[PDB]
Amino acid sequence: MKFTVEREHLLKPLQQVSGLPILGNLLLQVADGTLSLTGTDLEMEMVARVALVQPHEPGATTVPARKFFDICRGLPEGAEIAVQLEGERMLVRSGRSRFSLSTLPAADFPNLDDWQSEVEFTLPQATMKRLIEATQFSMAHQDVRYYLNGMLFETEGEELRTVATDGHRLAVCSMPIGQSLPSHSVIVPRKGVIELMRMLDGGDNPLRVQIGSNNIRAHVGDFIFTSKLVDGRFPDYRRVLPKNPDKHLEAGCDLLKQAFARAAILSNEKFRGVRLYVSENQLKITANNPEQEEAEEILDVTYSGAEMEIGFNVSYVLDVLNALKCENVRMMLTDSVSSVQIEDAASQSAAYVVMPMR
């Protein structure tokens, strides 16, 4: 196995694939004028393909991922990196820098089982980025309800939808992708969502997604990501949307966020409770803690509806406001023991639902 490639063509691919001892290695394969790099944890797999425009020789091996990445990253801008297999070592040469890395056999590298694609669609990279970033923060953190630790990906009509929830708060985001899709839902584990997000470079290259009965695959440029799915019965976001909200509040997002952030300082450190008092064109936020300390914020808002008092975990509210990168926010309420819906005043593409504290 031999190849010689410029550093700039190796870096990004190594980065992408690098994020049983053999699981700490990358599989390198030279075949048909292409270098393939694969990384896996048994649950998911990233593969990059690199065209070889210089002389090269076929073969495969496996080398330490971090060490190989760190060597290439440490080399200077515009370096050429020559690689060849010698005995049980992989030699790397650039300029007058030389390295000999340990290897494990390519035949020992684990392969995910083959599976069949049941649903396929394409979408812009920016649509996937929007879908994930809109909801990722609402996924559970190591909940014993495993399905809550991942992200629901749902197809309905011509829309792709993400849903994330931890049993207390929920995020949902739907985007049109211009293709007739089957009605279908799968749960992607948290590590899969992180990787799916990482492979979005920020360019013209559109995403091709393939879903099987137990797997999902995403193709972007010269990268292929594959993950297992999660089994379990994911919550239905439709249940938890305020059915016919009679109370509507509109306020500046940043103003609201800064007031919640200040009030949070004097909230219970563990329970994070704040109280909202809504009245005509006014919101008051209060917080107090076991040390008897007290915060009060009063803000001008646009509010029609009856006066009411409602409690929330201020962290959940702040998370939503930080996720809403916008000028004005709309909140839709029912009563003090029911969920609140929070949205961008200018877009209905994402919705956030937070259940109150008694």
Binding site: T165, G167, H168, R169, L170, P235, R239, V240, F271, N313, V337, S339, V353, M355, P356, M357, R358
Partner: peptide, 5 residues
Amino acid sequence: QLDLA
């Protein structure tokens, strides 16, 4: 905190 429902 109430459970979301």
